[PDB]
Amino acid sequence: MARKQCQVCGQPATVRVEANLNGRHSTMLLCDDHYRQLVRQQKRTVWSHPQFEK
């Protein structure tokens, strides 16, 4: 129950983000673009792309 929307914008959140805080399951709802932007803030872990590689 308790329908929540994107906490940033009033659009339907297609992504459910479950964050653990001291065991507490925090359910944060964001749109896809927001979530991608959020993960983007965390930098990129293991990503390789040819820059001058052939």
Residue 31 binds to Zn ion (criterion: CB under 5 A): yes
Burial class (CB in 10 A: 0-12, 13-18, 19+), 34: buried
Q: How far apart are CA 42 and CA 19, in angstroms?
A: 14
Which segment (17-25, 28-36, 37-45, 46-54) binds Zn ion by CB under 5 A?
28-36
The residues with which 25 forms a beta bridge, in sequence order, are: 20
Q: Is 28 in the site for Zn ion (CB under 5 A)?
A: no
Please report how close the Cβ of residue 52 comes to Zn ion at its closest, in angstroms. 37
Which residues of this chain interact with Zn ion, rule CB under 5 A? 6, 9, 11, 31, 34
